[PDB]
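User: These chains co-purify. Model them together.
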Amino acid sequence: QNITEEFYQSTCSAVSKGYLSALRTGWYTSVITIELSNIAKVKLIKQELDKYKNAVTELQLLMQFLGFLLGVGSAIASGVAVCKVLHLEGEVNKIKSALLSTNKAVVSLSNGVSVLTFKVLDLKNYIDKQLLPISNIETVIEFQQKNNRLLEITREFSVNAGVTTPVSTYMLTNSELLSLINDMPITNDQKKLMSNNVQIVRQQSYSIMCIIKEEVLAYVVQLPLYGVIDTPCWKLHTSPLCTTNTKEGSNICLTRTDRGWYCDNAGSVSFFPQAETCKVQSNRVFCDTMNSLTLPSEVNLCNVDIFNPKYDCKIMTSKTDVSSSVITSLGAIVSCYGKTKCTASNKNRGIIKTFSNGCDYVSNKGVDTVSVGNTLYYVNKQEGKSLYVKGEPIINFYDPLVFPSNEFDASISQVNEKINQSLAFIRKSDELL
Amino acid sequence: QNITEEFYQSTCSAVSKGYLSALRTGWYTSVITIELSNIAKVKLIKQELDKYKNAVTELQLLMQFLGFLLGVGSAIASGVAVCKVLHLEGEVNKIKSALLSTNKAVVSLSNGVSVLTFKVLDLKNYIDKQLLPISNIETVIEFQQKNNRLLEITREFSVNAGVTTPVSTYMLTNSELLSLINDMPITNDQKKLMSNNVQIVRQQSYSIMCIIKEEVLAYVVQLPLYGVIDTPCWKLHTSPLCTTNTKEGSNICLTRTDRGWYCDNAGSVSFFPQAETCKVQSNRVFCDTMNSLTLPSEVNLCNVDIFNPKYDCKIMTSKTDVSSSVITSLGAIVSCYGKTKCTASNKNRGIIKTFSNGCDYVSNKGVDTVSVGNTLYYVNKQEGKSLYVKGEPIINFYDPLVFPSNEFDASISQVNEKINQSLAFIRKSDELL
Amino acid sequence: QNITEEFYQSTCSAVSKGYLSALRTGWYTSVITIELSNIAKVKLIKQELDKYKNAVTELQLLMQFLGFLLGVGSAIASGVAVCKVLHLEGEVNKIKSALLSTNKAVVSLSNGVSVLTFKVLDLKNYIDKQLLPISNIETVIEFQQKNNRLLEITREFSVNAGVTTPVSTYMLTNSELLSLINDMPITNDQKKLMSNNVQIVRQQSYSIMCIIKEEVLAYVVQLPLYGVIDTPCWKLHTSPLCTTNTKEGSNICLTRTDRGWYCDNAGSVSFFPQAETCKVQSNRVFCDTMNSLTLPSEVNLCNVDIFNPKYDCKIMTSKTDVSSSVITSLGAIVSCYGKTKCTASNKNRGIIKTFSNGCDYVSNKGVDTVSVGNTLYYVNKQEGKSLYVKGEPIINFYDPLVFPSNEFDASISQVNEKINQSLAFIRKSDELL
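Assistant: Joint model of the three components:
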């Protein structure tokens, strides 16, 4: 897989490279229908047939740091747009007519939308051609199986107010989901990616209850669409970088705020400031463009040179020199300040390194845990090569007398400009004397 | 329903009107009891009777932007207050005695609390009057049905440490929940609202495990109380408003921070800064006053005039001119800055509008998606009328030389006051020359 | 239990004492294995045996304020480290060989890790010694019971992408979990604590799907380790403290930002800024050191004296004088400002106190609810003694002309230092006249 990582002592940050993209860029909606019946061991069927009427009753009763820079979307706007078309007159019968001979038919909606309608369960057929004439053991088995799926679908929709996620196997089975993947108009690369990670596909999917009317239960499944695949991705880990003066309250701190996931995307870079919104499966990174910013590709220069003139690297400043650790992909960043006991240990041998005041780093080769104060961090044991890029911490380049003490959404240039405003004021008033 | 929306080009904000309120203002607590038994196809009953003892064993083992301005409540403080009364001596028998003939009896607690006690399952009767004498198929059916509910109730309480939400149908069935709604001392308007949105009621409810003692399992259901209904509500959408100078790093930005839900409430306005804490069902807005601030009604003047003297409109400032979009109720706000490609498209025809640098807006009439950079947003297809209120963007009225560069919790007056402090300093030092 | 609480009028804060610690400090990993079969009422077994093959198919398809100051850990790094060892050649057979006679055997891994391997379900034995020879009712019962557990384990892993939490009873039963607690190398105090709060243990546990290969399904259970028990804990509640001038926009506010849980830990204090990450069971406080900072023990002096020279107490400043309430353990803090109607009421008697502008406090003795504006707060009815420590609000000691108007991550000394910079500038320019 070749996962690599570089730590930067100058900026107290680390970049993990070698990942491949899998970005949710669009949606694939399809209408899923279940035909209903409008109504010895028969006591078993009578009981199961009353669970049926309770599920129909429940369904009809249902319808009567930089994360703040992100936009605001409507996650199920595309799926709900299909439900509202189905509420029109004759639109449900257009589906019920095309699904009279086959189970998977493309019904063009009245507004020119080509939805892939798929009937997955035919209780109308099984109830109207097997039980209304009224004894084999398979008949009670085949009914308790088809009815159990309707009960689970009803169970999820009632507890989730008609919108469920992830999409369960009762909403859409693997045999049916893999059938949709082979029929949607996408690349073979996209089909192979979805087929090998169906659980990730289910977690990024939505199941929206639309309508139950005229012996038909319809709900829209909103499937993810991966329009960006196999592009380079890298994760940026940052930690506070402070000075280490002896007396408390005399130290200045600096933290890069642009941490998160980065993936090359169409000549630009997609930046995901909330790394918790991306799921990692080996070297594949599943993200969602809804939680991303589109930045110029020059943003990658901040990791090698934070003072470059092409991009203005984002930082925040404070005077809070508290100790903590950031567990990276192949190691651990450690910000040790004050009287905190910061160590890195091995399970078989114990403490093998004691960190000094400042920001340091250790790799997972030989290290299993790090301890910062009273917090024990287990490190990731992923195979990969780390590189310790030595350098002077940039916080030493600043004079604490004219240092902007508390900025939350600043940058290297904003700090330098605010320093010049202070130095120019000192310069002009020193001349008065 | 008549949902309307106005966009304000001067402040890069939009207001969606035409909604009706449904605010959770109080709680209705009731004690739910399940009487227990203290102990051919009999092999089916013996198996189901051991699931019974496992559930009893598990139950006894169980008991041995402006969101930061909100207060801090205790969500289940009212329900837990009822559990602690039931732990007193003889208080469980007061319930077990009044529920000896009827299933729904009002037992006045020792501290003057009038709780509506409701026995929903009588396993003590079914086990002590149908199986201890010891073969009909209905007896195995009626026992596997009553026992399955106890197993599900036990399943939810163990995984949730005795506090579950939403309240499932096993905790309280629709027939029992609708019985409680008809018996609680509230308006007919309140009863009709809860009966048509039982799934929303379940999501705003709590189920608290109290005690299992003396053949009685007691748990308190905490139901929502909607003391504010059918008042006007409106949602405010905001987006960053920046200048569009050519060179990077020379632009100033301004964002209204008072976005969220607003509902008229008792001469004041309830403001919900986290719009994700409110659920929209058509034109009804279900919120919770616990996540609200009580503001004067003059706060609505900020949408028409952000420089009014009656209310001080809240804004934040920055120099970060990143592009993004905010999906409104009937359209989309687009903040396009820098080299970002911002478009609005139709599914059948493609790109129909290309946005320029600045803050613009488009309605859902004819537009299905907007693209900002690498992010594709689907717009809501709700029926409604939008109005583009043209105006000069207020960010052009400020001089970047004396602009407060980074404020996170400021207002129009706070910015103007900080500008005067800079202009008065420039004025008095220019006179020295 | 002796829960006490002191309110501090000078700083608008309250401390709840009398709690005992239960801190998750490490992890206990163990490998859980399920042996699989590689393949009248027989129609019931044929149906259940096809559910078996569907579960095996699904499993193989699965593998192909101050919170921002916290560090970043990898929660399942220790459990995943054990999965990656099991993927090595012959490592699964080392477990399958040692579990040939007994169900609980310690298999030393190839990297010197001593994992406690535990086989909980033997479907390979039941299928290969009871059904392949092919009619008793118990055989269909004993198979539908063992198979149902595999179906639930498969159900949770598929919807959670192979990592589930809390750990359900199907992943690990109470009889098996209590067996692991008695065998792990910890104190009797630690074993008794886990045995009385198994549901809390399950909520702090992880179940990680490792591998399914060679008729063996292996998944690692990651159990919490409580290395800090029965130490004093206390919770700090804070609320905005503002001036109460008549005209709007002329008031300054001050809020202590160090609210959260505090527990004495190894000569230092573990601070949990997100009190929502700690669970309270009576007087026991279950937290996780991953969400904690390690502060000096002198931090407790801020509650008695916020101007002490030993520790620099953290505060934030603003001009936003909005009303709200903070529900404490034994009472309620009320910040009433402006025209807001703030009251405290009793259920039987109604309003018993009307708050004035400023920050006040009331205890739960006699008070059941407080109302701030349009928000009704229920107070906790925990038994305990409150103490109202009177004092002058510190916000009156500041001159609004030289008050730092908006600081988000500041302290008492940072504010005083920024005031001296303003007073020294006023002093030197007044001399010019």
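Chain B touches chain C through 53 residues (CB under 8 Å).
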